[PDB]
């Protein structure tokens, strides 16, 4: 009776930054994947560990819809085994990831004439993120021998940095909105099923 809330995940009025990527938990609903099928507006769309065609007829225990915003050059980092600022310090996928990744150009939405600086990433971190880790700590990154007593300055840098999203940026630096649909099947009842009941 109840469809899975895939609309409020994509057609949401506004997404979050990459370091605070926002997670929606999908359980107890019939999964209508056709919103992926008909919508050809998708620039990037790749599924790992599972086929998209053989998906609408397979029951899973839980689905996890992560959503955030990055730039074009960084989109290829949203995948297992990848490295980079986004993959290492913002959003890391496990090597045995089984799901799909979707991304589309949102330059019309997430760009202001003066540069929309609301979206952020983490530029520094003492170690790489574990898979599906969401670090949002604003601890001053220590870069030098002198310890940082919560103060900025010489080798004391603020860990977060802002994107410079302008309408006139090249397609490489334009804002893309990204959604990662991860899937989990455990020794437990499958609450999410395609139309094949």
């Amino acid at each position, epitope marked *: 009776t109840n469809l899975c809330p895939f609309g409020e995940v994509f057609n949401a009025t506004r997404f979050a930054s990459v370091y605070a990527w926002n997670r929606k938990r999908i359980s107890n609903c019939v999964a209508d994947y*056709s919103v992926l*099928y008909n919508s050809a507006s998708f620039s990037t*769309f*790749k*599924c*790992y*560990g*599972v*086929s*998209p*065609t*053989k998906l609408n007829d*397979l029951c899973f225990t839980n689905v996890y819809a992560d959503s955030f915003v990055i730039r074009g050059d960084e989109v290829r980092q949203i995948a*297992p*085994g990848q490295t980079g600022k986004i993959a290492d310090y913002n959003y890391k996928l496990p*090597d*045995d990831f089984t799901g799909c990744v979707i991304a589309w150009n949102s330059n019309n939405l997430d760009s202001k004439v003066g540069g929309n600086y609301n979206y952020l990433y983490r530029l520094f971190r003492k170690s790489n993120l574990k898979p599906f880790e969401r670090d949002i700590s604003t601890e001053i990154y220590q870069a030098g021998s002198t310890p940082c007593n919560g103060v900025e300055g010489f080798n004391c840098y603020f860990p977060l940095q802002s994107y410079g999203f302008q309408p006139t940026n090249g397609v490489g630096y334009q804002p893309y909105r990204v959604v990662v649909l991860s899937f989990e099947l455990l020794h437990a009842p499958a609450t999410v099923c395609g139309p094949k009941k």
Partner: antibody
Framework: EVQLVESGGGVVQPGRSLRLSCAAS????????MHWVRQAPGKGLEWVAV????????YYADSVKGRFTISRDNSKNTLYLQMNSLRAEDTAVYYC??????????????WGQGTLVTVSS | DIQMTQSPSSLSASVGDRVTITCRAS??????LNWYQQKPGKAPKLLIY???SLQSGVPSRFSGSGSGTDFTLTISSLQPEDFATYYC??????????FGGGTKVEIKR
């Protein structure tokens, strides 16, 4: 006993269009995902595109996305591959292939003998 | 993207020898690797799918193995109708299927 018959290959100039067709036989065609896979002369094999068993889903490689178009007619048991704006990189023998579906992921169960498509001006 | 390094690039082996071919992945694939045969000119043909599952109608002498990145195809006793170029093919990246370079098996002499 499974057969696939490609046809429609031939010489073609750059930027033109060409229609390929695979005729399936001896299995339930309308219930298997279908594949196109190409192989340049002397080079290795290259996955091209996928269409679902119902024809609702259409997926392409990054080298041909927005430039080829896969389709299928289940009543005629045929698999179509429209090739618009052919470049020199497309010069290859193209194969149609049945998925098999025994996995959550795509594999190639049976191969057609293929048809030659040469792009040259 | 995922690349597949298949080694050796070309080998020489006579009939009856225990032939082994290695296929290595740029990153982890659970077990979604596939081994294909291709005679010169003829179309390819499925031998092994999903690491080590023998396709129906393929001789029992063929056998796959391996998990993670370093996979292996093995012919226990080579036969004359087996001299052909063997490809390996990953599937984990479903919407970006990539194959290996291949390993032609030439008749040793």
């Amino acid at each position: 006993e499974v057969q696939l018959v490609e046809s429609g290959g031939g010489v073609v100039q750059p930027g033109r269009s060409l229609r390929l067709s695979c005729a399936a036989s001896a299995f339930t065609f309308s219930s298997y995902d279908m594949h196109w896979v190409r192989q340049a002369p002397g080079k290795g094999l290259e996955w091209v595109a996928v269409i679902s068993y119902d024809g609702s889903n259409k997926y392409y490689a990054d080298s041909v996305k927005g430039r080829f178009t896969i389709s299928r007619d289940n009543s005629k048991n045929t698999l179509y591959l429209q090739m618009n704006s052919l470049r020199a990189e497309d010069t290859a023998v193209y194969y149609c292939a049945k998925d098999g579906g025994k996995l959550w992921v795509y594999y190639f169960d049976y191969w057609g003998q293929g048809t030659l498509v040469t792009v040259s001006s | 993207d995922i690349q597949m390094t298949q080694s050796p690039s070309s080998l020489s082996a006579s009939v009856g020898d225990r032939v082994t071919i290695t296929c290595r992945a740029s990153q982890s694939i659970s077990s979604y690797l596939n081994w294909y045969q291709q005679k010169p000119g003829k179309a390819p043909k499925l031998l092994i799918y999903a690491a080590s599952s023998l396709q129906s109608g393929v001789p029992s002498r063929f056998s796959g193995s391996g998990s993670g990145t370093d996979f292996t195809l093995t012919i226990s006793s080579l036969q004359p109708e087996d001299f052909a170029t063997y490809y390996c093919q990953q599937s984990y990246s479903t919407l970006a299927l990539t194959f290996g370079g291949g390993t032609k098996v030439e008749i040793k002499r």
